[PDB]
Amino acid sequence: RPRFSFSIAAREGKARTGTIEMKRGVIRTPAFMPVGTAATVKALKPETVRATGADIILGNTYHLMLRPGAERIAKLGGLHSFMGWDRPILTDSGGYQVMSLTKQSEEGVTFKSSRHMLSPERSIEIQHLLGSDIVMAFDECTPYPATPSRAASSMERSMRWAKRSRDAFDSRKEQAENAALFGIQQGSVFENLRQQSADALAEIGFDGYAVGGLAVGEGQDEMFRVLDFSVPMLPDDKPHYLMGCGKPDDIVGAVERGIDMFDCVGQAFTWDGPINIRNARFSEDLKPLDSECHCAVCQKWSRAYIHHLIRAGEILGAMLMTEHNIAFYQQLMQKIRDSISEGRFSQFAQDFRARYFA
Amino acid sequence: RPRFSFSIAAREGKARTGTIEMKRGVIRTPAFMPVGTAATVKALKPETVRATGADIILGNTYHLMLRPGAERIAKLGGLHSFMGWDRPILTDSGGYQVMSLTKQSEEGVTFKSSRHMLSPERSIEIQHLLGSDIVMAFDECTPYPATPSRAASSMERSMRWAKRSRDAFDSRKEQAENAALFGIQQGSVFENLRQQSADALAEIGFDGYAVGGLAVGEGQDEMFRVLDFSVPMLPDDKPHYLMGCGKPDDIVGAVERGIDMFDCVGQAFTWDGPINIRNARFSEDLKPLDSECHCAVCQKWSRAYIHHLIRAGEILGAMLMTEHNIAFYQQLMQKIRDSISEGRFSQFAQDFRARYFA
Ligand SMILES: [Zn+2]
């Protein structure tokens, strides 16, 4: 396989389906990437993650640099070897997590976990040490709400940092030849700033483009409104990645708006909407979590059992709930991919919402 | 298969190896039974429990009657169906756990979790509702240390309760025809009381005999001393079960003394003794938890990774540590079974201790 090749197989409106080929594997798009914060997808073996249908998982520059350490993971053979996942891994750059979980300057950010530094150069270096396949540019995630002046200043700094990310990536031969680099669009909810950001990123040139600065409390209506004008600003022939949860209804609407990639960190998803398994009404419910789901959890255990496990604080409860929820997300992505390929995605979206919100 | 058939295939000194046949499966002895407190073997799917080599698991009358409830589990189809384990299950009677985790009388014990009652009759009924395959008599676990007078009074009550357990079991046709009933020897550390207890239990007649009242703080030397004279008092042609951890060295010595069955609830077992994986010296150790172990954990992940997971409080850490530890115990039981079958168990015991304690 090549270092990176994005191919679009079919389209419906703004929606696309296709494949990203990378050295460690093929990624089917639209894709959902389970999040593996501390070098683990919570409560799941990698083999189980793969069994649910995941093609790629996400890791985080910030969390891994704190524990166990980036240099340490490199010495031990890299993140793939360390955690036992041999398929592509996307790593976030730390731009978000430092701020949510400190001293900022044009050079970068210094923070306390134990003091640490992040810059475009150090963030790209850490992702190299981890051995990540899709490297994210180091940005500044603009708080919401932001004034136009503040959003502009932040966006401009992020674009300067996008250039530094690009050059740091390119100057490291093993990384440039084997991994890909995605830029991150900023600009808050302002169309002109999003346009300037897209223009800057396209001029620099990246393997993919993320829509950053959303899923930060603005609500689905606002997110969709911003995606409406922001995604068409991005190069059409590269993947589009919406950063952040990422609930099932968010994913459907975002795919309708041209997004190709997604992530999201007692709640069980079903085609009839989410349920909270802790609720007393499930204590003697022999049905599986969802009636149609083909995951192993729904083939074997009842709502009643999982209700008991979660209530009792049992680890198996978390294992089963997580496997089901990630498998549900993958089944959603498969239905989306199939429906786009067959030119019936707009109908699928309508059907999905009718039932999910009934 | 029959309701219950214990066959001894080979012997070496006091040690025996053979099989217990029951309707839900065959149990190879000497056996280790993983403990599944709240209708789950902690952090493991039943399929994983089976993969480590377990033939039977343990459940508890006390814990299950409190949560989710015995009547509830019966309504939902029984414990096997509820948790997804279809092989034999042994259930303790509550005799121990009520006392460690209250008003006593000749009739039974009343306690607060929410007030509850246990008697020989109610304990046997609960085990029936759970659908357990090996039912334990309801006893009183004598505290240690105990005076001879107190040990005698307690032992005598337990023997009266053993008779009530027997009659309650026999009066319930579905239970008597499909499950087995084990009696529990008491008498503390006193030979004459252990003899009286064994005589009483043998006169009543049980499918198997447990040595109770040990693993309660007396230490290995004392436990072994008591097992030295207690086990030969038990009927030779029925299984002998030592209640309670149950560390690997305890198991070897207890098998040398004629015990057939065992249970035990950052520590990883290795053939060179236990290690605590949290220790900093494992932070960059690429070796598996144990060099010889053939479990899936040792085939795939390093000490360094598991060290990281446990330190970080990650659920996968618990999953991997538990799978390894239970698999190690099963590999120990297999080596014991093989060595007895081949008449070289006394040598194996010596070799095991030399290395484990080196
Ligand atoms: Zn499911």
Ligand SMILES: [Zn+2]
């Ligand atoms: Zn192992």
